């Protein structure tokens, strides 16, 4: 279901901007999880270009130049 599916994501900021932050931050902390940003709300949190709209060319460029 949609709230169990958005809280079970491979990106803990996406699952922490949404409902309960305690459960998700302890699960991510004891798992040692890492957030390869790669979505819209991680980049709205961290303050950069959205990887969808005009910023999709910027993220193509950055993903190409690694």
């Amino acid at each position: 279901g949609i709230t169990k599916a958005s809280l079970a994501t491979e990106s803990f900021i996406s699952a922490a901007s949404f409902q309960e932050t305690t459960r998700v931050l302890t699960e991510a902390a004891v798992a040692g999880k890492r957030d390869e940003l790669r979505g819209l709300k991680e980049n709205v949190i961290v303050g950069r270009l959205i990887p969808a709209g005009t910023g999709y060319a910027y993220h193509q460029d950055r993903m190409r130049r690694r």
Binding site: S6, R38, L40, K41, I50
Partner: protein, 288 residues
Amino acid sequence: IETPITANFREGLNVLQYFISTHGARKGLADTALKTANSGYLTRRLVDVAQDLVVTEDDCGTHEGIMMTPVIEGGDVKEPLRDRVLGRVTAEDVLKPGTADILVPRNTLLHEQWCDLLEENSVDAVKVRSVVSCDTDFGVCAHCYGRDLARGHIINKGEAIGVIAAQSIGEPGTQLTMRSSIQVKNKGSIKLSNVKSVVNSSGKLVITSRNTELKLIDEFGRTKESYKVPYGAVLAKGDGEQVAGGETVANWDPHTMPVITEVSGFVRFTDMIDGQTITRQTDELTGL
């Protein structure tokens, strides 16, 4: 309430009629002012499950996609195929309903001109590409989404479709509310699906399958009606037959589950002993 409000607003409502009116309107204001919270929280859950999904390819390179048919509840055909397969790219190439013709090719967007050439040929159902069958890792390819919907063309490489989709489902959350036998209507041809049947002694084709779908196909090929016929019903008609508009074609009794047979012969009571298994209840008002 069994006593209505016989006075309109040009005539005056008296006191009791206005008080019953206030019952009916206070319920509506409470429903909107509490409905809006669930509508907003639904939009939030939807844009946070979507949140990631970006059109990131141009073709996933597949041949799978869902089978768009017109939807029919049992009344007249509710939503036509041109509402469901408008601007969605076909999965395999649609055969023209005559015989084995390449009417449309296998990766064409179906805009209004293609949909009119679909409606002229009375095309049954289209196997079309759906987003849930997209093979793209981490995103949706540009063909399996479909038309842009506010642009005439296909979706561009990039445009966030998860967020516009989540907003478009949750945005009408305010307008939504919060709190015998089969009689045919039109005149056409009969077809049966999921059917395993047998002819009774009288002639009415009874069915030995519970899950039988009774379709009414017209003289053109498209499916215009559909119904669900239970296990053991008295069908007035048969397979492939032509009927008249309004003629009863089905009959059953839902309060009496039929234990009808396939063959004939004599009846024996196997493991039926009166006193422990079955009981003797002679009827009061009839005697049988």
